[PDB]
Symmetry: C3
Subunit: 186 residues, 3 copies
């Protein structure tokens, strides 16, 4: 990856390049998926810069941001038989880590009997924004799997699935005074 002049104009005809340099329409399901990972990465960035999380939560979120570029590398690289060089791929390893974090940060929390109205601390509010963008990215990743059941891995979608659960847990940790809950029809 070399970011130099940034604008190359090779996308001005509505096509763009996968990581193997093959050309796709800018509406291609695969591009949509890793573009949505990028949008999710930016949403986490806003939680970091405007929410001012403590060091431990900062460290978790920075690792997730790095994971999301691993997922984008995966989604942008077609799966091929016997590649010349090993591609970067999401592994179950990644999802186990998210689950370990889910359990650790959920341990100190009481169960909820309704949904949370997002808000409270700036950090909590921004983690809810990130949560919903990640969930949008997950849907796009499943759509890429549908379009390419052999060429696209399911593990990016699985990673994004578990990640939005972690972001919900972290949004609660970021409101130590408690959340306001939904009153159905009230």
């Amino acid at each position: 990856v070399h970011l130099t002049r940034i604008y190359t104009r090779t996308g001005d005809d509505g096509t763009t390049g996968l990581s193997d340099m093959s050309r796709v329409a800018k509406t291609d399901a695969r591009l949509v998926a890793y573009a949505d990972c990028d949008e999710a990465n930016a949403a986490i960035g806003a939680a970091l810069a405007l929410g001012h999380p403590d060091t431990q939560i900062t460290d978790v979120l920075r690792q997730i941001q790095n994971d999301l570029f691993d997922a984008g590398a995966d989604l942008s690289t077609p799966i091929v038989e016997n590649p010349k060089h090993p591609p970067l791929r999401i592994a179950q390893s990644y999802i186990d880590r998210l689950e370990g974090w889910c359990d650790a940060y959920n341990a100190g929390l009481p169960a909820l009997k309704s949904f949370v109205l997002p808000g409270g601390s700036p950090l909590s509010a921004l983690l809810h924004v990130a949560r919903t963008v990640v969930r949008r990215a997950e849907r796009s990743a499943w759509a890429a799997v549908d379009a390419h059941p052999e060429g696209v891995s399911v593990l990016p979608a699985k990673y994004l699935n578990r990640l939005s659960d972690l972001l919900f847990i972290l949004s609660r940790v970021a409101n130590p005074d408690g959340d306001v809950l939904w009153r159905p029809g009230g």
Copy 2:
């Protein structure tokens, strides 16, 4: 609604559950609609947490957040003849309330002869973000009606239609010094 362990892994195959436990693809038009309501709810949360609205506007926004979970409940519950239990549904009631708020908060504002360039106060800017996310949720709700003209109600989309108008009005109330306007081609 019980939120306990959060991650269940039952969505790791790209399917999820409606409120009646029936299974749908994670690209299903109905899921997209109430997921986008969730995304809109988070955007309002950001306006509350980073925009610091006064008490009365805070009360309006918290009621809208509650309404949006009512709309998500509606969209996630297929309409059936003679249900066992009365489902939670959006009613005209809800939209009449949004209209009453539109009229009250628009009363003190002069007419505009161009579009507003979003900005100014943090609250105004965040309300514009929420406004555009709500409009995206509205389009998804109409797409859900198209895919299920008998099983999905139109009132969620109608609520979202009127809601983005209210958020525009409130975004102006949140810039008492006035907004910067579009200069076509300038």
Copy 3:
């Protein structure tokens, strides 16, 4: 453009109006494109209001916000043979200006050998959010071109293409102490 009562209820059946008053479904590709320009405009607004840019960047972003309504006017107005009045259209001039800003703001920056983890200053983070929303708007504009290769211009998409490159450059200028970089698989 006259903004008065705001809510008219003429969109309550899932249809809306183009600039020529012709009726389209609220899922129409053209509407999605200029609605996404609106969402991008709001994201820039948040960067202005919460990011506190200096005078030079403020002036650039306000011009871009104005451009995006020019782009929305273009996308909302079908191209016709010999129209009665000259329509507002994006022109190459707009993109040349974006390129001039890319070159000027990128001149003092070192090349990058990896991707940036969005974060740092609020301004940098919010410019990354805007960057990814603009890229989503670009995809929608290409989708509108595909649906209407004669009735929709390519210049809006081209403008949005170059614009996300500028927002990336400005996001780096807004982190003068440097960005955190992606470590593949680390």
